[PDB]
Design an enzyme around this catalytic site. Structure first.
Site, mmCIF file in Angstrom:
data_model
loop_
_atom_site.group_PDB
_atom_site.id
_atom_site.type_symbol
_atom_site.label_atom_id
_atom_site.label_comp_id
_atom_site.label_asym_id
_atom_site.label_seq_id
_atom_site.Cartn_x
_atom_site.Cartn_y
_atom_site.Cartn_z
ATOM 1 N N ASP A 101 -3.982 6.852 6.128
ATOM 2 C CA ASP A 101 -3.257 6.000 7.060
ATOM 3 C C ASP A 101 -2.148 6.832 7.685
ATOM 4 O O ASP A 101 -2.416 7.916 8.198
ATOM 5 C CB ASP A 101 -2.662 4.789 6.336
ATOM 6 C CG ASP A 101 -2.104 3.754 7.298
ATOM 7 O OD1 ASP A 101 -2.893 3.176 8.071
ATOM 8 O OD2 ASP A 101 -0.879 3.522 7.284
ATOM 9 N N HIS A 323 -10.146 -0.509 4.876
ATOM 10 C CA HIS A 323 -9.023 0.400 5.132
ATOM 11 C C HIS A 323 -8.424 1.133 3.928
ATOM 12 O O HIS A 323 -8.005 2.287 4.052
ATOM 13 C CB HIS A 323 -7.906 -0.370 5.839
ATOM 14 C CG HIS A 323 -6.696 0.455 6.151
ATOM 15 N ND1 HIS A 323 -6.710 1.482 7.073
ATOM 16 C CD2 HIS A 323 -5.424 0.378 5.693
ATOM 17 C CE1 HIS A 323 -5.496 1.996 7.171
ATOM 18 N NE2 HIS A 323 -4.698 1.344 6.345
#
Lengths: 346, 346
Positions: A101, A323
């Site tokens: 991320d 994610h």
């Protein structure tokens, strides 16, 4: 295990592990938003067992690391400078850097600006996007300005979540009302099971407009928390003890520093103009997620990986996971990292 | 012991203690800067043993309580509203409120605005200063504007520390370089032993100009840390384990929220105009310190206590101790509080 490093005036906290001989290539792990060194809990033991000196830090503004209020303290090059401070603390000429991320842009940029200190770089979830910092279906490498590109092409009377985050007013307010539940909401929502279920609710169109009518896309005046989805039961990969850890870190740190990352994007895109064109030369690798929004939005940047990274050692897609890639698929991720590091020389 | 309260959208963490029957008047303890619920560690057991339900909170921006970035979240009435939320959590109509340093203005103001919810108020270190928030040798009750009054009358080419704090840029930068040492510096410096030693270095003039040429008074462009004094050995009242606790809380929370208190003074003085004149009616008490700067600067406000507080039950001066009053004189402070609460009815 726990260490406090002084990175040129910035206190950086970290959790380390390595062979008893205290030898082996250095591997630095960079977490994203809203995470912690704890997000790499499944990699640390694996990497250390394979003979590497693993260092998983709390980025500035997170956990036990320095907390700044001014916005300039959260610009990409400051983040990068922290990584450099880490290597310097360990007296390491080079190091393998892995980021997830928000950790990825910092790892990518670290390799871009300091190839001489990088033995290899791996971005997870968010592919290299050059001055773009975060590649999007429209701008894979920051072709246009971040902020304005968000406004138009992202929602008629809607709001791009990143611009919301950057405001650091209402976002924080909706979080503090119930921080633990906010973490659960944001987690399950963009997770694999959460995405599969959101899709399962089919009742397929252009991706560039799928963002809109999406979770990360809200109607002006609303709250991002309004679109979250909570699980009937805690997923097997993200238990209550995990949620309790993260909850404890953030009720102590807050989201101010973390959100300033998003607030500085436009500023990062600016700071990185003087780099466009220049290739990223260290051996690179990208690990994406089938249902991960990061992987999906940077789809155009990934198809053109070799165009920007000559030593691009390949893209790797993990299926069924969302994610939170290294947590949702801890062993798949470990295999990939161990293979990448294994075939490289420190 | 530990509790998480929801004060109308704000998470307030607290450490509670009381008789096993879980009955007794409620006593709320408000800490100051840069402190914690831990600052009341010596009072909690005493008050709970005397039959009171004691609640020591982390004010917003501190410890495990909500962390806001916007400045308006740190205005006096927001702080006061948190105290009200505490009583509401315990379903208490009234409560005795005790505040130290920054905790005092909040306790004083809480009694000023909500006399119907206050059975008694005790300010430690910082005497009641009305709209002044913090009384100073020049303005005991906020006669003039806070900010500007700081500028002039406080140093030719110098800087008032509070205005420095309020900047929240350089102050934080000098802290993060070495947070643990900063806490030790600031602590020992304004402590009793630290003040006595600073005076012992005589080698007596007007107090209003003693501030200048003082620790809390720095020359523009300098750093407040530049004037600190460190002890040869950890004072007996503030050990390494205590410093380690505080260090741990702040390396996790940062000073952003805390410093916003100082930043909003001018705003508080503003917000409290519509109160000037009105007396503070709950039974009140002030505990000062011979060498405490808070007690010294509010010297004029204390001589005129009865002028603003009709139920003023008296001033109490603890000798030889400095600013960290309830820690430097834990038992003296306990006696005073137990006497005050003892003679009052919940």
């Amino acid at each position: 295990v726990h260490r406090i490093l002084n990175c040129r005036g910035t206190r950086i906290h970290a959790v380390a592990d390595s062979p008893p001989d205290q030898q082996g290539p250095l591997v630095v792990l960079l977490h994203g938003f809203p995470e912690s060194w704890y997000s790499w809990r499944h990699q640390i033991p694996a990497l250390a067992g394979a003979g590497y000196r693993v260092v998983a830090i709390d980025q500035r503004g997170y956990g036990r690391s320095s907390k700044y209020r001014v916005q300039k303290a959260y610009r990409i090059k400051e983040l990068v400078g922290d990584v450099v401070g880490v290597l310097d603390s360990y007296g390491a000429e080079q190091a393998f850097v892995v980021g997830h991320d928000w950790g990825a842009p910092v790892a990518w940029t670290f390799a871009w600006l300091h190839p001489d200190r990088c033995a290899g770089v791996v971005g997870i979830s968010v592919p290299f996007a050059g001055r773009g910092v975060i590649g999007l279906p429209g701008s894979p490498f920051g072709e246009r300005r971040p902020s304005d590109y968000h406004l138009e092409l992202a929602g008629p009377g809607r709001v791009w979540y990143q611009d919301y985050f950057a405001v650091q007013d209402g976002i924080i307010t909706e979080i503090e009302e119930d921080l633990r539940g906010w973490l659960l909401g944001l987690t399950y929502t963009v997770s694999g099971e959460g995405m599969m279920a959101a899709t399962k609710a089919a009742v397929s169109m252009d991706p560039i407009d799928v963002i809109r009518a999406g979770p990360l896309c809200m109607a002006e005046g609303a709250r991002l928390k309004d679109a979250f989805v909570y699980p009937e039961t805690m997923p097997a990969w993200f238990t209550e003890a995990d949620l309790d850890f993260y909850t404890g870190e953030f009720e102590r740190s807050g989201f101010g520093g973390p959100l300033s990352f998003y607030h500085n994007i436009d500023n990062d895109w600016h700071d990185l103009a003087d780099q466009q064109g220049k290739p990223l030369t260290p051996p690179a690798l990208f690990i994406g997620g089938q249902y991960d929004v990061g992987t999906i939005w940077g789809a155009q940047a990934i198809e053109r990986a070799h165009e920007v990274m000559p030593n691009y050692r390949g893209t790797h897609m993990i299926a069924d996971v969302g994610h939170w890639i290294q947590q949702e698929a801890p062993e798949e991720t470990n295999r990939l990292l161990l293979d990448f590091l294994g075939g490289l020389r420190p």
